[PDB]
Design a protein around this nucleic acid. Sequence first.
RNA 1: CGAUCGAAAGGGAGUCGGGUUCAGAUCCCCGAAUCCGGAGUGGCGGAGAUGGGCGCCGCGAGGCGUCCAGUGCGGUAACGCGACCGAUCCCGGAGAAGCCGGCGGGAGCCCCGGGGAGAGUUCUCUUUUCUUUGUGAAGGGCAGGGCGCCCUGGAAUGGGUU
Lengths: 135, 114, 69
Amino acid sequence: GKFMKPGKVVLVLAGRYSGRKAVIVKNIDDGTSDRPYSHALVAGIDRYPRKVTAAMGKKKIAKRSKIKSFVKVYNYNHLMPTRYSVDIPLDKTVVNKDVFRDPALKRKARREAKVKFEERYKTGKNKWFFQKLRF
Amino acid sequence: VQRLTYRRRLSYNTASNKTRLSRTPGNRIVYLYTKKVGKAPKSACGVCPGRLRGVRAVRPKVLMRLSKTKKHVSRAYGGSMCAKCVRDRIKRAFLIEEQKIVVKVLKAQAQSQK
Amino acid sequence: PRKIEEIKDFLLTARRKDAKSVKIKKNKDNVKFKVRCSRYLYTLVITDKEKAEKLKQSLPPGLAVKELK
RNA sequence: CGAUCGAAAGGGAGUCGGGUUCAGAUCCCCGAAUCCGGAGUGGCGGAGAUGGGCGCCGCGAGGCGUCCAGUGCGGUAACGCGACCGAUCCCGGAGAAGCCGGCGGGAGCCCCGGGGAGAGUUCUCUUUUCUUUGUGAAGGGCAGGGCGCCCUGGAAUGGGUU
Ligand SMILES: [Mg+2]
Ligand SMILES: [Mg+2]
Ligand SMILES: [Mg+2]
Ligand SMILES: [Mg+2]
Ligand SMILES: [Mg+2]
Ligand SMILES: [Zn+2]
């Protein structure tokens, strides 16, 4: 059975975002004419939220809980799939494949990834996705 | 044929007293004292025999002059470790951490029945 | 030495505060404009004899000109 | 982890071209650079960064008011772009490496065929013989050399290759 699904959490193995976690938002298992290899559009996080503990102020928690996201198309052999899955919405009208021609649309794709990731992080769910991989 | 002499008082062919020939606007051949050849950094993994890419090979005190983008690669462990041993350490750090969760689950699986 | 490709940046380098002098070299198939700044001697290379003469009037008036020969 | 000393051949950032004396020149003069250190007011420019939603107005071009975000960006990747916060602590690299053989590249010198310039022979011959015929450091671009770097793809009728 195929596992490269649009809910799967993967690890990035190469590039600038190496060692960072992403969620597949659109897999393409058989290559397009421009990208002959099997690939996937993912939407991950660049800057992990910092360690937030008690005996801290409320405006400081909102400062440590700041997620910076990224949107990128990756080859499959540059990805490390996990068993973990997250049910994040990520509506596909704003996060898609012709995002990589207009930088303003890439800003909106990163913004829409960022707001949903911060909203999911402030509920205490999918907590393995938001801790950095120690390597 | 114009035979040429040293321009400094060190008359011995040591490692620091290395020269090269140069043709001059006055139409004569001079010695130019060269600098030692630099080396790219070796990877921090310790297994790859090749040197790192994207970093200029200079003498160590030249690295004061150079900007940061000439001294590293935009990656985690960039300019200090090769990409092969970065991704082979990402996989290792993920998989051993997963296997520890498997061992933790199988511990409670034994303690549940016993 | 630095080579300025365009004409527009040459005017800023000539209008710098540290521009000590400007000098014009008239050789064959080339006109050379050299601004002596504090660090570099900036050279503008013009292969158009009409633009050389209009730029020669277009130098700023506060700069000292030395027409070389 | 032992004060301190210990190499004008080890390590050790950064200067070259022309000219000049009766005797000194990478030191004097001229012209080009370069290294290190310094800065409250930080001298200027650039980066950080000036984006979006909602509600009005403006025909629109766009303009006020709120709610937020914003410690950069691109490439599948090797990695790239002019910057691109971060301490105590930790890890690593450079400095920092023997002798010999073979091969390849690039210089300098030598060699051959011509153009100039000036000399030598010429009793006879010799389009002949001799001399000379260029560009520094630093920056930018392009050859060239090397890669135990990456992507596609899967190879026996085994191939590639010195
Ligand atoms: Mg010495
Ligand atoms: Mg040369
Ligand atoms: Mg670099
Ligand atoms: Mg001593
Ligand atoms: Mg010494
Ligand atoms: Zn390695």
